[model samples]
Target: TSKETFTHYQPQGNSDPAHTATAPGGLSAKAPAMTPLMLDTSSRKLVAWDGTTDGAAVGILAVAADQTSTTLTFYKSGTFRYEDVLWPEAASDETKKRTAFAGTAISIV
Candidate 1:
């Protein structure tokens, strides 16, 4: 034979007088999260920049079939060189080993 049993405990009241509630503190305002840049492979359009507003095109990014190899090509010429682009050296072992250069031509593999 099977039977269901139930057990209950009595509720206890607070006895501390020093635990009285005080004025509620105000909550801090939270900042909105920024959206990261997304690349649409189907349309080959990079979203999040000014390109979505006007006809002005920035640069082209070519990704290899493996997805690991990538190349970035710039449209306009400028005084910026490979050293101008900042690359974190102590981020990770994978990032430290990877090569990245910018001179109207950047490649990461």
Candidate 2:
């Protein structure tokens, strides 16, 4: 049972501003943009986009028997980072080796 998960965090008070645009029906509408995060299974890397630029590798995913997890954290102090960890099944204190990878300042913005 292989699984992948992604978690995103934004700094407090950091939010997307409201948008307004003209619609075909002569009505006001809110335009939406996308900032996507993806995992490259082949490369074992976590990728992120700032809605315009090409995707960038943010962190390297650790190998896991059953689960691969990634977390992205952003701070108001101009900090951006990612952490990846491996969760294996039937792990023991001795044989259950856990590995982690962390990357910072890779430019998500």
Candidate 3:
């Protein structure tokens, strides 16, 4: 038989006092988890800095190493990219936002 379990741990008392609550922080630069320019998508639109707002925005990246694999998979190493933009006027902030839920730039392969 197979079962699952998890272990939980908590700080016994107050957190270690020696650690600073915050760093004597310098400005932190933001790096894209996925390169913005490398993102590509479907929905039949071109995405780029060309200043067009009328269509879907997308970025495309290819898995150079695994092109030979049988399955079309978006594994950790390679999966193409697409960034879709929504009209702020038409959508509420939360509703308008999505993480690569749908497909991406179809032609990347």
Candidate 4:
């Protein structure tokens, strides 16, 4: 194995921590965890920025929560991509929203 620099984590521009908490901190920066409780009938990968909202997903959560109380086969995080994310698919908006109930934990593979 070899080592490589993280050019993707460079400071491209000045960002204000007051305006948004998403701004990276000091010399070492950390990717803030966005864990939005929103869900869909089907599984999906989070891409959009959630500057203020809590539980806003920053990675892939491949497991879909079924209301039917049926079993499910989980997929690794690589199953989804940053582009063309398959947003939750549900019968109705309410059922989809219900999946976001408290204590709901999705596998961030």
Model 2 C-alpha lDDT per residue in residues 1-109, reported as the tens digit of each score: 9999776854454333422111112112221222223344565333332222232323322211111223332121122332222222223431222111123332322
Top of the candidates by lDDT: 4
State the number of backbone clashes in model 4: 11
Worst 10 residues of 1 by lDDT: 23-32
Better TM-score candidate (2, 3): 3
Model 3 TM-score is: 0.18
**Weakest 10 consecutive residues of candidate 4 by summed lDDT:** 23-32
Ranking by TM-score: 4, 1, 3, 2
- Between candidates 2 and 4, the one scoring higher on TM-score is 4
Tens-place lDDT per residue, model 4, 1-109, is: 9997665575465454331222111111212222222322234322322223333333332333333313222322232332344433332343332233224333321
Candidate 3, residue 99: the lDDT equals: 29
**Per-prediction TM-score to the true structure, in the order listed:** 0.20, 0.16, 0.18, 0.21
Cα-based lDDT for every prediction:
0.27, 0.27, 0.26, 0.30
Provide the lDDT at 48 for model 2. 34
lDDT for model 2:
0.27
Residue 53 of model 1, lDDT score: 24
- State the lDDT of candidate 1 residue by residue for 1-109, as single tens digits: 9999775754564233432211111112211112112234455533322223222222222211112223222222222333433222332443332322222232433
Angstrom error of the Cα, residue 44, model 4: value is 20
